Design a protein around this motif. Structure first.
Motif, PDB file in Angstrom:
ATOM      1  N   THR A 115       0.839  -1.202   0.000  1.00  0.00           N
ATOM      2  CA  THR A 115       0.000   0.000   0.000  1.00  0.00           C
ATOM      3  C   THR A 115       0.875   1.255   0.000  1.00  0.00           C
ATOM      4  OG1 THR A 115      -0.381  -0.305   2.407  1.00  0.00           O
ATOM      5  CG2 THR A 115      -2.126  -1.019   0.880  1.00  0.00           C
ATOM      6  N   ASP A 116       2.069   1.145   0.583  1.00  0.00           N
ATOM      7  CA  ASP A 116       3.039   2.257   0.589  1.00  0.00           C
ATOM      8  C   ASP A 116       3.431   2.542  -0.856  1.00  0.00           C
ATOM      9  OD1 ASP A 116       5.011   1.732   3.614  1.00  0.00           O
ATOM     10  OD2 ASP A 116       3.594   3.325   3.089  1.00  0.00           O
ATOM     11  N   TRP A 117       3.718   1.469  -1.589  1.00  0.00           N
ATOM     12  CA  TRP A 117       4.123   1.571  -2.992  1.00  0.00           C
ATOM     13  C   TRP A 117       3.058   2.249  -3.834  1.00  0.00           C
ATOM     14  CZ3 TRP A 117       2.223  -0.567  -7.595  1.00  0.00           C
ATOM     15  CH2 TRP A 117       3.072  -0.425  -8.712  1.00  0.00           C
ATOM     16  N   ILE A 118       1.789   1.979  -3.529  1.00  0.00           N
ATOM     17  CA  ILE A 118       0.682   2.607  -4.261  1.00  0.00           C
ATOM     18  C   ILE A 118       0.420   4.052  -3.787  1.00  0.00           C
ATOM     19  CG2 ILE A 118      -1.792   2.518  -4.872  1.00  0.00           C
ATOM     20  CD1 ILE A 118      -1.707  -0.456  -4.443  1.00  0.00           C
ATOM     21  N   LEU A 119       0.411   4.255  -2.478  1.00  0.00           N
ATOM     22  CA  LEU A 119       0.139   5.586  -1.948  1.00  0.00           C
ATOM     23  C   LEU A 119       1.179   6.627  -2.385  1.00  0.00           C
ATOM     24  CD1 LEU A 119      -1.331   4.575   1.498  1.00  0.00           C
ATOM     25  CD2 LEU A 119      -2.422   6.038  -0.234  1.00  0.00           C
ATOM     26  N   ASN A 120       2.443   6.213  -2.464  1.00  0.00           N
ATOM     27  CA  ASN A 120       3.520   7.114  -2.873  1.00  0.00           C
ATOM     28  C   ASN A 120       3.438   7.573  -4.335  1.00  0.00           C
ATOM     29  OD1 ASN A 120       4.502   6.860  -0.262  1.00  0.00           O
ATOM     30  ND2 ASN A 120       6.126   5.397  -0.795  1.00  0.00           N
ATOM     31  N   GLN A 121       2.470   7.074  -5.094  1.00  0.00           N
ATOM     32  CA  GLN A 121       2.360   7.500  -6.486  1.00  0.00           C
ATOM     33  C   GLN A 121       1.182   8.451  -6.639  1.00  0.00           C
ATOM     34  OE1 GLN A 121       2.937   4.204  -9.474  1.00  0.00           O
ATOM     35  NE2 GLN A 121       3.023   2.847  -7.691  1.00  0.00           N
ATOM     36  N   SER A 122       0.505   8.739  -5.531  1.00  0.00           N
ATOM     37  CA  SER A 122      -0.647   9.629  -5.567  1.00  0.00           C
ATOM     38  C   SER A 122      -0.272  11.091  -5.454  1.00  0.00           C
ATOM     39  CB  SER A 122      -1.621   9.287  -4.441  1.00  0.00           C
ATOM     40  OG  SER A 122      -0.949   9.252  -3.198  1.00  0.00           O
ATOM     41  N   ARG A 123      -1.223  11.934  -5.804  1.00  0.00           N
ATOM     42  CA  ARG A 123      -1.058  13.378  -5.733  1.00  0.00           C
ATOM     43  C   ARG A 123      -2.180  13.777  -4.771  1.00  0.00           C
ATOM     44  NH1 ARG A 123      -5.673  12.026  -6.994  1.00  0.00           N
ATOM     45  NH2 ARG A 123      -4.879  12.340  -4.847  1.00  0.00           N
TER      46      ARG A 123
END
Lengths: 636, 636
Positions: free
Chosen positions: B53-61
């Motif tokens: 989830t860290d990997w996904i959240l870090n690509q958000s704006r």
């Protein structure tokens, strides 16, 4: 009388509404109230149950049928088993049927019906069992079953969650006002009225992974760290034979690196780890085993074979019971001080590697499970599983207790080796299981049966198939062997004719792939059959009552009846073997008269002395010509 | 933000205890905290969930990902589907896996793990789906499912017990503190952050036999006498063709004796039969349908095909919804006064035989199910099943409501006939399903695909297999066709590349025997395989993640990537067919450049113009020689 209370109840409930489906073979000759649509029949289960219980009750006298028949008959010895004909069954399967009359089978349907088998239905079928000529019913374990670590959607009758209780699933919702232990007691009353004995099955040495005995006796089981669950397997030693190790090998086994890693996976019981935590959870709602895993991160280990290097997988739905408080005597000098209780080949075969401290409290509990059934329901005998592992003193006790209450009780040993008859008799058993089904299904091996049977010192269950083997209807030359094999086998010396549930209608699909079975038997049914690929031991399965092998049904009935017409020769006539390379044959002579059993398993026809001849029908001719795979019973 | 709340939670729970099993392919390249024993891998599900989830959240704006991507992108038309690559899935199956790491699969195990698929796991797999090149996930029905009238131990996603709720079974016990609708909303947020669209499936015309809508709207269903359940079947008329009847035939059909017996099986709703009884039960605990059967002796009928003389069986796990308050107009003059509401061929196809009174209250409910999902979770599109039966006004309404909220929403028609593209576009759909999988798997039929695709007026899902058909991995010449068929199909004009769950690892066993399927496919697996004979639609099934076809996985990834490198030719290049008897081939030209798709399905090799060539790997040669079943993408 419960059987009578159930009768009363069915009459009150009757309504004449025919929406409960049953196969035509379940409807007795006297019952007429049924509709026949699309192949199957419909009835008011209350009218069917009322007329059938009436039929059974009207044959009773004024005695108490909740006790062994040996009592009403005044028997003091187990001689009765030698004159009996056994029908073997797994109630859950034998009495299953889609009562909706359309679509797919369901454990419980929207009409309120339980399609799985019940004690109530096992009772409605008594007129059928009786028409096969059977006078004793053998049942697989019907105790409460665990629902953890299952292979399919149904549990194995062998993972006993509670030896003292019956599984609530055998209760039938049609009899809402009644409890399961009543329905069963009423079932046994019905069998006794009809002259039918009841024999149950028990496995002392094991228990379900989440046995009910865990709350009050957590120290009767073994434990391992949860993180060691995945790779828990019996430590191999390739350089050693595939067998139960002897004394010398233990010294080698205990010095192996993998065995030492194995010993290190075990812990102390949850009660001895954290007394306060134990007392907390012990009093909680929910599955005892889930609670312990979550609170102590420990779990009971799966079981496994006691022979080293065995390729069969681990038994995940069962664990072993702690028979001794201490570790095996002959192996203490190999352990590290403080070694928790652990499972290994020697610990499992307690009969060979015992400690010096019997877990007396467990031993007494174990020795009181059968008696609990004798006294509460009046059962007539039992089969004891895995007896090979029990210490001689614990077995001597288990037998003394059943024999003390009923000296006519029959104890059946789960012994497949017919050469172990002498040792089984010495242990206190009255009957051995044997393996006649293996030779009976091979034309090249069947001829060995005559000599094998004659040497026995105990009678055996003469079968051509059992729950663990392939069906006789699928062996080579099935169309002929399905009639020839039982004819030759049921007339053997020291025999107890055995009929496996489903065999009487020519069932093909195996119930389990246990003994001598080929995985391809898993697909003998059509891929469009609702039960394609299913195995009754772990999945919901309905026998093929709607498309039965009438030829086999009719022949089995007539065969049992003629065999019983001559029981005296089989039991007290002088036996003489006459078997040749291409002709299995033998005779019994008694008081100047003689009978001959013959079957041609060769490639060319053969001729023999005639007289009055039976082979399904009676005829009379001086010479009998047997073509290949033909048989006959000659009476001179 | 829920996705972030779940992340926070996993970090709190982490412990470093690796006992939860997952297949090696589920572990992403960045994750390193895992043990590898016996083929599989073990982890702390909380550490795996936290790092992913860290990997996904870090690509958000800083935008709101709980709404359609069309919003964050500012789209006003459904043009996006034409540039997409779809991954089709049944969550329950795609994410199933025995997390114990030994023994047999279990819906829920003793370690507390749900082995069946969950929204949480569907999220952990997003990095995998993304590596296939897919940018849209299509899901089969995930609404609440009925557990009545099942074929196996698992329900069909198609018997919708509640269109407005998600099935509680998709909740994962690891996320105890959360509810199912949250886990799902968080799942959709994760897809949006990654650029992945979500498309759901709905079936307006039907409902489970025990639909939740029965308590408040018993008059929205049909009813028949319980005693008529067993023999309820669609009345045949052999002298008539096998099709949906026209007007003239209705006059004949209604004069048949069996049809008249059919019409007489129906009753009035339970509310109109006994108002007091209805109000009594309506407020009781227990399954609504069992209660009604027991109290009124009536039940909803099973569904069935709307074509007369169809040999397929009845659909027992679903019933039809009452679309009109009155009976079909064109058939009133054939009925007896007081005829209760009944089901027949014409009533089912409301689009052709409508009454004069629309059940307005039901129509509005139906037209508000998709919007409920758009607004609550932000889904991007949907597939509508059985649209053939809906009246033009009810369909026009269903579409106006989704398009009103999001004009970029994509509506997919469940239309297998590629010639019905023109009528599907006229009805208001944006995409048709088609049947390319049938031609793609036959060397003798694949050549027809080029012309079929070019004539379309709407794009289609270019597939080589779907949930209802056999796997491409089991068609003739599988070892070659499993790569050749998708290469030729995904480059077709008007195409939307479709990847069926399991296809990417070469799965063989079918999920269902629906369309064009042979019952023998039911046995392609080894009889020693835990899932031998099982069908994901009605039974618990785990795809073969531990023994995947790496050759197919690797090729699918590279193929999708090269196809997207040339998307502009496929979408805006002038197409020209060059197919011959033994060579399927075509080209796209745009701005002086040209690409050629070629595959040899003949018996002798063939040669063609070269240049830069792709066939799994890039090469360069002037002439390309294609042996039988070889293919290539030539760039001049």
């Amino acid at each position: 009388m419960l059987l009578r209370e159930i009768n009363r109840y069915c009459k009150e409930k009757a309504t004449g509404k025919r929406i409960y489906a049953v196969p035509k073979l379940w409807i007795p000759g006297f019952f007429k109230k049924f509709d026949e649509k699309s192949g199957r029949c419909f009835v008011d289960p209350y009218e069917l149950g009322a007329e059938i219980t009436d039929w059974i009750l009207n044959q009773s006298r004024e005695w108490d049928y909740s006790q062994p028949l040996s009592f009403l008959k005044g028997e003091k010895t187990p001689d009765w088993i030698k004159r009996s004909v056994v029908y073997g069954s797994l109630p859950r399967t034998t009495a299953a049927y889609n009562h909706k009359g359309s679509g797919y089978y369901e454990e419980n349907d929207v009409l309120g019906f339980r399609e799985a088998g019940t004690f109530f239905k096992m009772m409605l079928l008594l007129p059928f069992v009786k028409s096969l000529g059977a006078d004793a019913i053998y049942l697989l374990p019907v105790s409460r079953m665990s629902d953890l670590f299952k292979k399919g959607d149904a549990p194995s009758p062998y993972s006993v969650k509670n030896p003292m209780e019956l599984d609530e699933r055998y209760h039938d919702p049609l009899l809402e006002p009644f409890k399961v232990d009543e329905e069963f007691k009423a079932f046994v009353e019905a069998c006794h009225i009809l002259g039918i004995r009841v024999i149950l099955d028990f496995i002392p040495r094991t228990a379900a992974r989440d046995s009910d005995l865990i709350r009050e006796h957590p120290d009767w089981f073994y434990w391992i760290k949860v993180e060691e669950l995945a790779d828990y397997t019996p430590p191999r030693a390739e350089e050693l034979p595939f067998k139960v190790p002897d004394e010398d090998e233990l010294e080698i086994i205990y010095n192996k690196e993998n065995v030492k890693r194995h010993l290190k996976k075990f812990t102390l019981p949850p009660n001895l780890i954290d007394p306060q935590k134990w007392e907390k959870i012990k009093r909680e709602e929910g599955n005892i085993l889930e609670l312990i895993v979550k609170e102590f991160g420990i779990i009971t280990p799966p079981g496994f074979s006691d022979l080293i290097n065995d390729p069969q997988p681990t038994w995940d739905d069962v664990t072993f019971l702690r028979l001794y408080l201490d570790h095996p005597e002959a192996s203490k000098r190999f352990l590290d001080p403080n070694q928790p209780p652990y499972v290994l080949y020697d610990v499992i075969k307690a009969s060979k590697f015992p400690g010096k401290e019997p877990n007396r409290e467990l031993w007494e509990y174990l020795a009181g499970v059968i008696p609990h059934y004798q006294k509460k329901y009046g059962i007539d005998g039992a089969r004891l599983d895995m007896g090979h592992a029990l210490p001689k003193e614990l077995l001597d006790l288990i037998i003394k207790n059943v024999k003390e209450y009923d000296p006519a009780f029959v104890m059946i040993a789960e012994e497949l080796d017919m050469e172990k008859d002498k040792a089984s008799k010495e242990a206190g058993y009255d009957v051995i299981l044997g393996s006649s089904w293996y030779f009976a299904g091979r034309v090249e091996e069947i001829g060995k049966l005559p000599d094998i049977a004659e040497e026995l010192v105990l009678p055996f269950l003469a079968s051509v198939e059992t729950p663990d083997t392939p069906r006789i209807a699928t062996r080579k030359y099935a169309s002929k062997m399905k009639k020839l094999a039982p004819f030759v086998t049921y007339f053997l010396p020291n025999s107890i004719p055995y009929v496996n549930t489903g065999q009487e209608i020519g069932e093909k699909q195996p119930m389990n792939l246990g003994l001598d079975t080929d995985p391809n038997l898993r697909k003998v049914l059509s891929p469009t059959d609702e039960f394609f690929g299913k195995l009754a031991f772990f999945d919901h399965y309905v026998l093929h009552w709607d498309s039965p092998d009438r030829g086999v049904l009719n022949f089995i009935k007539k065969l049992i009846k003629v065999r019983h017409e001559f029981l005296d020769f089989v039991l007290n006539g002088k036996f003489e073997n006459l078997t040749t390379k291409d002709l299995v044959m033998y005779s019994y002579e008694k008081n100047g008269q003689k009978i001959v059993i013959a079957a041609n398993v060769g490639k060319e026809p053969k001729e023999i002395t005639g007289g009055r001849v039976w082979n399904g029908k009676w005829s009379d001719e001086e010479k009998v010509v047997l073509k290949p795979l033909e048989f006959a019973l000659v009476v001179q």
